Swiss-Prot record, chain B:
4'-phosphopantetheine is transferred from CoA to a specific serine of the Acyl carrier domain by the C-terminal PPT domain. This modification is essential for activity because fatty acids are bound in thioester linkage to the sulfhydryl of the prosthetic group. It comes from Saccharomyces cerevisiae (strain ATCC 204508 / S288c). Changing V108E: Does not affect oligomerization but lacks transferase activity. Present with 17000 molecules/cell in log phase SD medium. It comes from the Eukaryota. [Alpha(6)beta(6)] hexamers of two multifunctional subunits (alpha and beta). Changing V5S: Does not affect oligomerization but lacks transferase activity. Changing D6S: Loss of transferase activity. Acetyl-CoA binds at residues 6-8, 32, 42, 51-59, 68-71, 98-100. Belongs to the thiolase-like superfamily. Fungal fatty acid synthetase subunit alpha family. This is Fatty acid synthase subunit alpha. Changing V7L: Does not affect oligomerization but lacks transferase activity. Fatty acid synthetase catalyzes the formation of long-chain fatty acids from acetyl-CoA, malonyl-CoA and NADPH. The alpha subunit contains domains for: acyl carrier protein, 3-oxoacyl-[acyl-carrier-protein] reductase, and 3-oxoacyl-[acyl-carrier-protein] synthase. This subunit coordinates the binding of the six beta subunits to the enzyme complex.
Swiss-Prot record, chain C:
It comes from the Eukaryota. It comes from Saccharomyces cerevisiae (strain ATCC 204508 / S288c) (Baker's yeast). Belongs to the thiolase-like superfamily. Fungal fatty acid synthetase subunit alpha family. The gene is FAS2. Present with 17000 molecules/cell in log phase SD medium. The chain holds residues 1768 to 1886 of 1887 of the full protein. Mg(2+) binds at D5, V6, E7, S97, H98. This is Fatty acid synthase subunit alpha. The lineage of its organism: Eukaryota, Fungi, Dikarya, Ascomycota, Saccharomycotina. [Alpha(6)beta(6)] hexamers of two multifunctional subunits (alpha and beta).
Length: 118, 113, 111
């Protein structure tokens, strides 16, 4: 048992800002979002997924200038969560054996829901 | 394990477009939505449910049927390719929940194997 | 069991003392009142209660315990609690989110 939800306004992601993007998204993530019909929506969705996933872990919370590059969404095909660094340790350290995530958006906002297994 | 989410703008469903409705909704689905206070919201909700459900399987949407009765959780009933690919993935059950406000509808589904 | 609920932030009238006090526990009310956006907070807890009820498959009965830096916990009472045991529901988890427009909550129940 673990569940997480995250909703983001599409305009919360500034795509121009290379520093922020590259800082928070893995290369496979950035390449995926860039290839989408709406790049900004795509980043907003992946961002929601990262947040939703972290929430489903239920761990010592995060915060600026903490980064979410740890939590990777691999959309290669249903999404896949792959954890790294602290994210990964704290997940094993909580007994979390798997995380699943789904993502959606419309014109207004993006939503992501994650469920964790322990 | 399996989760799906889908969000739709209420105005993505044109209730007037008989072709589209008839192509994507089963007769009982159509009857249910039609009997609701807000028909367009109802269709947008059932549509989100179908999308969410398909996503939770991890594999036209008339195959995925949502059987709703107000005051009782919706039920998912799969058909055709939807059904095969679900058994073919080991999916033993799918649950769905639906909601909307003035702006949009959201649905979340979880699948079991 | 799964439940989702989405609410417009403005669906909660904080000036409606009757509704607030009828639907939220004192802990709940105290929590929401201490937040940066009180109305968003109430809208979020409200979505959670609704989401949780849906996941049971069967609202002051359904209480959401919130403290910052932590995931919410569901604690059931009264009829809510009986009907949950009476359904074999062994645990309920909930997550909450909002933006400027609306709040969303998703709950999953165990049997």
């Amino acid at each position: 048992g673990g569940v997480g939800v995250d909703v983001e306004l599409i305009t919360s992601i500034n795509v121009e800002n290379d520093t922020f993007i590259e800082r928070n998204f893995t290369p496979q993530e950035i390449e995926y979002c860039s290839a989408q019909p709406s790049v900004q929506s795509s980043f907003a969705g992946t961002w929601s997924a990262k947040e939703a996933v972290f929430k489903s872990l239920g761990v010592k919370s995060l915060g600026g200038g903490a980064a979410l590059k740890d939590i990777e969404i691999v959309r290669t095909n249903a999404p896949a969560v792959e954890l790294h660094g602290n994210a990964k340790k704290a997940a094993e350290e909580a007994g979390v054996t798997d995380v699943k995530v789904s993502i959606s958006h419309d014109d207004l906002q993006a939503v992501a829901v994650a469920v964790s297994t322990k």
